[PDB]
Amino acid sequence: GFKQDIATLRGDLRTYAQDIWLAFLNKYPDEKRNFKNYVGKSDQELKSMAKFGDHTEKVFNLMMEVADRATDCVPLASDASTLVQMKQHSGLTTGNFEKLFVALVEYMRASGQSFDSQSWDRFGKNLVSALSSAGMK
């Protein structure tokens, strides 16, 4: 289920984080505009860029904490407010997060592993609802 999936992802988090983030950026190429330095680079090149690996892992470090603190795939209001108020998320709208979790769920469905893809789909929707409620446009 959802909780075990958190453990599975945390057991190889840098690799899962990079693979899911790349699935997101490759499914939605315009999303690279939010990072600038990722433009014009293949996956293997991005994986050799220090900030890509370090920032992407930290993204998923926090994502797993928010998932772990959720109840029935519904994140805490305080976690949603943190994601809205982060200076690094100044530009973002809920659409950016919706697309990320579409790609994450698609990644899990295509995976050979028994991820609870439906729970991650609910989590993505519930997180988008919470971000909107906490003031993200």
Sites of contact with ligand HEM (CB under 6 A): 31, 34-35, 54-55, 58-59, 62-63, 66, 83, 88-89, 92, 96-97, 100
Cα(49)–Cα(55) distance, integer angstroms: 10
Is residue 87 annotated as involved in ligand binding? Answer: no
118 labeled binding residue: no
The answer to whether 51 is annotated as binding is yes
**Residue 129 to residue 9: CA distance in whole angstroms:** 24
Where is 137: in which H helix or E strand? none
- Closest contact distance (angstroms) between CB of 110 and ligand HEM is 20
Least distance from C-beta 132 to ligand HEM, angstroms? 14
Question: Helix, strand, or coil here: 74?
Answer: strand
- Of 3 and 58, which CB lies nearer to ligand HEM in the complex structure? 58
Which among 54, 78, 48, 52 is positioned nearest to 66, based on CA atoms? 78
**DSSP secondary structure letter of residue 40:** T
Distance in Å, CB of 1 to ligand HEM, minimum: 19
Per-residue 3-state assignment (H helix, E strand, C coil) for 47-70: CCCHHHHHHHHHHHHHHHHHHHHC
At closest approach, how far in Å is the CB of 37 from ligand HEM? Answer: 8
Known binding residues are 36-37, 51, 55, 58, 88-89, 97
Q: What residues are designated binding site for heme b?
A: 36-37, 51, 55, 58, 88-89, 97
